[PDB]
Design a protein around this motif. Structure first.
Motif, mmCIF file in Angstrom:
data_model
loop_
_atom_site.group_PDB
_atom_site.id
_atom_site.type_symbol
_atom_site.label_atom_id
_atom_site.label_comp_id
_atom_site.label_asym_id
_atom_site.label_seq_id
_atom_site.Cartn_x
_atom_site.Cartn_y
_atom_site.Cartn_z
ATOM 1 N N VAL A 193 53.961 38.343 -21.972
ATOM 2 C CA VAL A 193 52.925 37.543 -21.332
ATOM 3 C C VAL A 193 52.059 36.893 -22.404
ATOM 4 N N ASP A 194 51.727 35.622 -22.199
ATOM 5 C CA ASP A 194 50.967 34.872 -23.189
ATOM 6 C C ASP A 194 49.511 35.321 -23.189
ATOM 7 N N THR A 196 45.722 34.516 -24.844
ATOM 8 C CA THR A 196 44.900 33.483 -25.465
ATOM 9 C C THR A 196 43.474 33.983 -25.645
ATOM 10 N N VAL A 197 43.340 35.179 -26.226
ATOM 11 C CA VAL A 197 42.024 35.759 -26.457
ATOM 12 C C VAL A 197 41.190 34.826 -27.325
ATOM 13 N N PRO A 220 48.425 43.182 -17.416
ATOM 14 C CA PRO A 220 47.321 42.622 -18.214
ATOM 15 C C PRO A 220 46.434 43.684 -18.833
ATOM 16 N N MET A 246 33.993 34.190 -16.615
ATOM 17 C CA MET A 246 34.727 32.993 -16.995
ATOM 18 C C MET A 246 36.145 33.357 -17.416
ATOM 19 N N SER A 248 40.526 31.380 -17.317
ATOM 20 C CA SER A 248 41.503 30.500 -16.687
ATOM 21 C C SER A 248 42.865 31.169 -16.748
ATOM 22 N N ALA A 249 43.535 31.264 -15.602
ATOM 23 C CA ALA A 249 44.850 31.885 -15.549
ATOM 24 C C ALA A 249 45.715 31.144 -14.542
ATOM 25 N N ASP A 250 47.024 31.338 -14.662
ATOM 26 C CA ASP A 250 47.988 30.767 -13.736
ATOM 27 C C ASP A 250 48.905 31.862 -13.206
ATOM 28 N N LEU A 251 49.509 31.586 -12.052
ATOM 29 C CA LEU A 251 50.301 32.579 -11.341
ATOM 30 C C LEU A 251 51.454 31.895 -10.622
ATOM 31 N N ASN A 252 52.621 32.533 -10.634
ATOM 32 C CA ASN A 252 53.780 32.009 -9.924
ATOM 33 C C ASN A 252 53.821 32.609 -8.522
ATOM 34 N N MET A 267 42.769 36.070 -9.274
ATOM 35 C CA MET A 267 43.973 36.727 -9.770
ATOM 36 C C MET A 267 44.041 38.172 -9.292
ATOM 37 N N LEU A 270 44.688 38.374 -5.482
ATOM 38 C CA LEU A 270 46.096 38.167 -5.152
ATOM 39 C C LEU A 270 46.949 39.362 -5.569
ATOM 40 N N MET A 271 46.666 39.946 -6.738
ATOM 41 C CA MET A 271 47.423 41.117 -7.173
ATOM 42 C C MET A 271 47.263 42.270 -6.191
ATOM 43 N N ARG A 339 52.261 22.289 -9.465
ATOM 44 C CA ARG A 339 51.085 22.675 -10.242
ATOM 45 C C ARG A 339 49.826 22.535 -9.402
ATOM 46 N N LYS C 7 51.078 35.168 -16.443
ATOM 47 C CA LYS C 7 51.689 34.443 -17.549
ATOM 48 C C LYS C 7 50.698 34.057 -18.632
ATOM 49 N N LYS C 8 49.453 33.753 -18.273
ATOM 50 C CA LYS C 8 48.437 33.389 -19.249
ATOM 51 C C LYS C 8 47.115 34.044 -18.876
#
Ligand code: ZN
Ligand code: ZN
Ligand code: ZN
Lengths: 427, 359, 82, 135
Positions: A193-194, A196-197, A220, A246, A248-252, A267, A270-271, A339, C7-8
């Motif tokens: 998993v990416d 971005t700290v 996570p 604060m 920003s994250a994305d989810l499939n 997030m 939804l989890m 998206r 993912k991020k």
């Protein structure tokens, strides 16, 4: 020999224009267009001063005095200037040339020069740059140039803390690069998993609150645990209190796989929705440590006015949802876009006793400034004034500094800056 | 733009191979693209990076050149700078020297005919750092001369960057005089926004120059600023700065324990700093025997550097003078051998110290 | 095949010193002492600066009597946060 | 997560006395320093009394005697504190004052302890009487 009539007529025209453009009453027009008109009129006056009078010193000083006369009427102008600066720097597509941008910045700087009280100015800078934390959408180097030209004539402390802002961002991205290199060198499966700290500092950046403790999903949580283990190594002596306000994250999600954009709390919601369906609001609130006041913005943002995407809806369709509104998970494929983002909530969530303490602070400062009168050169007075008080954080040396700065208006404490030796001594 | 994102993500969703099928999809995306949209730029980036895994260098150079001609005015400069840095990092991890310099000079010329003041300068300085990494001096003289001509104040950051580059150059070959000249020239500047790593090098150079010249007051300030700037940025140049700060605080008649400063407290149990910790615990609270034992127990770390070695004769002397001053206060007439016994040195050296102190 | 996969994640941290302060480096006593002079003869508070250098008030005052720089960082000292 | 001031203070005092059980002065001093930082907002006076007791104990255990004796003498006058441990604290104060380094502070504290009438009842009074007149 006969220019007095023209000077008087142009001064009266300036007076009437200024009293028309102050508009302390009759508000309602768009603030951004109002500030654009202010820029336009200031540039028109600048053009008149330059092209016709050939930058004459007499006309320059007379127009400066005129501006000082009609400029102090308004109060919430620095917020407008910061808004205009942020708006211009956000969208650099229109006028990417640095010359026009730097002339706009020069106008803003000279306008700020005739004004004072930069503390509110810079706290408004903090407010606009807090809500830089998101995607950059800026030019960066232009900000560096304007802050350097501001620091040239401003000095230290606030300029140094904005330099700290930039240095913190740069060192954060370099630390992120180092962590990515470490992950590549020593492969970790949970690093798939990416990450971005973007760690920050506490002594310079603004503070919001103590932040909640919203639960982290297993994967996570383990990723942040391994990041914490790495960061406790290398350079030690610090910890990381992860925040949740604060992010920003994305989810499939679901049927074609659609990529949704969520911001921290969504997030986790939804989890929690995932592992079992038929989940009600109280069940979610029981084990997520969801906030109370800022929860209102997100609760009415996930529904009640969604765009045509319509990712999620609730069966208790109502304006208010108190305790027992049962939520359901639905496909709701609707839009074909892959998206779909809920960033629009950021475009609407921004909308919408200290009396005794401030009285005590003012009285304490006033009695300290008149009563002390002790032998000082430049700093021991600051020591004795805080000595006199019994409890601390009440002195707040900044108030002493501003008091002694504004105390030079007449005879008392109007001593020579070149040799700050005699300061009424003990009298 | 509706179908634009959908088609881009359909081409992306392959994610297991690239049999020119994704490349054709990206070409169709470019065909339906409008006027320099970021979607097209990211599609080109994705196809370029995915075809790095499939070699085919000539097409790499061709479409990289067309991307550089595209980036003249298509998106905010931060995004283009980040993409350039990321692609350089991606291509540098696999070496590939020849195409590396091919890309380097193509970028140089592309930014030469494109925006120059803000984009070409950063790329040129990155090339300067990369070329310093190869220590292929001589041509770097031409590189630094052309950079100096390009920059030449209201350009504090650029001047500080070039000063750091040329200071690294001139300290590479022991050019102390030129190093001092560059340090003075940088000192003339009173307004800049330095990188967390750029200022550290020049501060270290200035501190070294002050220490070697003879003044032992500004050296501590310079070294402390260098260490404070090094704490956030980097790590290789951290222990040596602390050691030099400890030495500087040693030579300036002591004064306040340097490790008591909170910014360097955790760096105490490091083996490379334990020698300095013991040295400061010995120098403070004057003790001849402890200082001698610490000096003798660690010849390898202490008596091997070209800077600590030259300043242990100035040291081991202030401590004995302080001991003599402390012991001489209550007495009024004593024997020289009694001083010799506690001072741990012969009578002739005792007389030399006494005559120097009296004079 | 989990229902949702992360993912991020752009985390935001806030680094702070593990030990805020444990010593006034003029008297070698911790900041909550009386700064030795007040311990012998018995009010006493702490003082801070821009460099976030906590000292005893009396120690920093007697340092500033003849000097004008912070004892640790050796730069211009000015009062902040009492 | 922060629990409360009282819980943190009581855990700090417990670990401090446990350290003093096995003569560990540095860790006890660090914990008493963090208790010093966090004690100015405490509301319970019994916790403050126990804090003063353990502060005096750690100061005595750190080989610093004059200030420990002064703290013990100050604590010996507490009204809420019962007479038995008041006498215990006074005895500790006398033991600390006698075992110190000669100086003006030693003589001053010696005279102050001699002035108190309760110290007459104390067992080790002859040593105090001899010390007062500088035998
Ligand atoms: Zn102190
Ligand atoms: Zn004091
Ligand atoms: Zn300082």
């Amino acid at each position: 020999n006969g220019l007095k009539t023209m000077c008087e007529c142009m001064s009266s025209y300036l007076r009437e224009q200024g009293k028309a453009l102050v508009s302390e009453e009759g508000e309602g027009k768009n603030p951004v267009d109002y500030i654009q008109g202010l820029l336009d009129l200031k540039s028109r006056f600048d053009r008149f001063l330059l092209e016709s009078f050939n930058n004459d010193r007499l006309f320059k000083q007379t127009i400066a005095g005129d501006f000082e006369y009609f400029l102090n009427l308004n109060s919430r102008s620095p917020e407008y200037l910061s808004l205009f600066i942020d708006d211009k720097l956000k969208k650099g597509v229109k006028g990417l040339t640095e010359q026009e941008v730097e002339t706009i910045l020069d106008k803003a700087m000279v306008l700020f020069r005739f004004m004072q009280e930069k503390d509110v100015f810079e706290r408004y800078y903090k407010q606009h740059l807090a809500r830089l934390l998101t995607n950059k959408s800026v030019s960066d180097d232009s900000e560096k140039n304007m802050i350097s030209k501001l620091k040239t004539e401003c000095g230290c402390q606030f300029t140094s803390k904005l330099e700290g802002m930039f240095r913190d961002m740069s060192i954060s991205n370099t630390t992120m690069d180092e962590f990515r290199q470490h992950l590549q060198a020593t492969g970790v499966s949970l690093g798939g998993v990416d990450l971005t700290v973007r760690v920050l500092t506490t002594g310079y950046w603004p503070t919001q609150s103590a932040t909640p403790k919203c639960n982290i999903p297993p994967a996570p949580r383990h990723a942040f645990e391994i990041f914490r283990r790495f960061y406790l190594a290398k350079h030690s002596g610090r910890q990381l209190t992860l925040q949740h306000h604060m992010g920003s994250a994305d989810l499939n999600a679901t049927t074609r796989k659609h990529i949704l954009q969520v911001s921290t709390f969504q997030m986790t919601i939804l989890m929690l929705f995932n592992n079992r369906e038929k989940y009600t609001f109280e069940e979610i609130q029981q084990e997520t440590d969801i906030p109370e006041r800022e929860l209102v913005r997100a609760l009415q943002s996930l529904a009640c006015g969604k765009p045509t995407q319509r990712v999620l809806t609730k069966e208790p369709k109502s304006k208010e949802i108190e305790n027992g509104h049962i939520f359901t998970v639905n496909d709701q494929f609707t839009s074909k876009l892959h998206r779909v983002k809920i960033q629009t909530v950021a475009a609407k969530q921004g909308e919408s006793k200290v009396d005794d303490d401030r009285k005590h602070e003012i009285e304490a400062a006033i009695v300290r400034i008149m009563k002390s009168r002790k032998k000082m050169q430049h700093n021991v007075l600051v020591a004795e004034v805080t000595q006199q008080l019994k409890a601390r954080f009440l002195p707040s040396p900044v108030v002493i500094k501003k008091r002694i700065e504004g105390l030079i208006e007449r005879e008392y404490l109007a001593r020579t800056p070149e040799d700050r030796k005699v300061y009424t001594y003990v009298a | 733009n509706v179908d634009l994102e959908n088609q881009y993500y359909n081409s992306k969703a392959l994610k297991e191979d690239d049999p020119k099928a994704a490349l054709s999809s990206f070409q169709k995306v470019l065909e339906l693209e409008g006027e320099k949209g970021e979607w097209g730029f990211k599609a080109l980036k994705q196809m370029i990076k995915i075809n790095f895994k499939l070699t085919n260098f000539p097409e790499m150079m061709n479409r990289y050149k067309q991307l550089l001609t595209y980036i003249r005015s298509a998106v905010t400069r931060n995004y283009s700078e980040k993409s350039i840095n990321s692609i350089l990092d991606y291509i540098s991890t696999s070496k590939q020297m020849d195409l590396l310099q091919e890309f380097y000079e193509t970028t140089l010329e592309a930014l030469k005919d494109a925006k120059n003041d803000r984009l070409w300068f950063k790329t040129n300085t990155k090339l300067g750092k990369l070329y310093l990494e190869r220590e292929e001096y001589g041509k770097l003289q031409k590189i630094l001369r052309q950079l100096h001509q390009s920059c030449q104040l209201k350009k504090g950051t650029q001047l500080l960057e070039i000063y750091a580059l040329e200071i690294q150059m001139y300290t590479a070959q022991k050019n102390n005089k030129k190093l001092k000249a560059l340090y003075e020239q940088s000192l003339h500047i009173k307004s800049a926004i330095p990188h967390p790593l750029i200022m550290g090098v020049i501060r270290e150079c200035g501190g070294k120059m002050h220490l070697r010249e003879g003044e032992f007051e500004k050296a501590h300030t310079d070294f402390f600023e260098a260490f404070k700037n090094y704490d956030e940025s980097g790590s290789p140049r951290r222990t040596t700065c602390l050691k030099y700060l400890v030495l500087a605080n040693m030579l300036m008649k002591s004064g306040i324990n340097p490790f008591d400063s909170q910014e360097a407290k955790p760096y105490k149990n490091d083996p490379e700093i334990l020698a300095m910790t013991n040295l400061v615990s010995a120098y403070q609270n004057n003790d001849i025997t402890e200082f001698e034992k610490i000096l003798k127990t660690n010849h390898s770390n202490i008596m091997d550097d070209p800077f600590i070695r030259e300043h242990i004769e100035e040291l081991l002397r202030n401590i004995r003078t302080q001991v003599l001053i402390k012991l001489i206060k209550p007495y009024t007439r004593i024997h020289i051998p009694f001083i010799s016994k506690e001072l741990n040195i012969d009578v002739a050296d005792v007389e030399s110290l006494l005559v120097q102190c009296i004079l | 095949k989990k229902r949702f996969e992360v993912k991020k994640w752009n985390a935001v941290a806030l680094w702070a010193w593990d030990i805020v302060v444990d010593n006034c480096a003029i008297c070698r006593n911790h900041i909550m002492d009386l700064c030795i002079e007040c311990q012998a003869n018995q009010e006493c508070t702490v003082a801070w600066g821009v460099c976030n250098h906590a000292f005893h008030f009396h120690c920093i005052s007697r340092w500033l009597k003849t000097r004008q720089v912070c004892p640790l960082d050796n730069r211009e000292w000015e009062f902040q946060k009492y | 997560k922060q629990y409360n001031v009282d819980y943190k203070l009581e855990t700090y005092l417990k670990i401090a006395r446990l350290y003093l059980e096995d003569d560990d002065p540095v860790q006890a001093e660090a914990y008493i320093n963090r208790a010093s930082l966090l004690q100015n907002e405490s509301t319970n006076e019994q916790l403050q009394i126990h804090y003063k007791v353990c502060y005096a104990r750690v100061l005595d255990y750190r080989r610093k005697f004059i200030e420990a004796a002064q703290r013990y003498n100050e604590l010996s006058y507490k009204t809420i504190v019962h007479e038995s441990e008041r006498l215990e604290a006074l005895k500790h104060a006398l033991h600390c004052t006698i075992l110190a380094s000669a100086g003006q502070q030693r003589s001053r504290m010696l005279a102050t302890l001699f002035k108190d009438e309760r110290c007459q009842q104390l067992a080790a009074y002859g040593i105090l009487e001899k010390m007062y007149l500088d035998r």
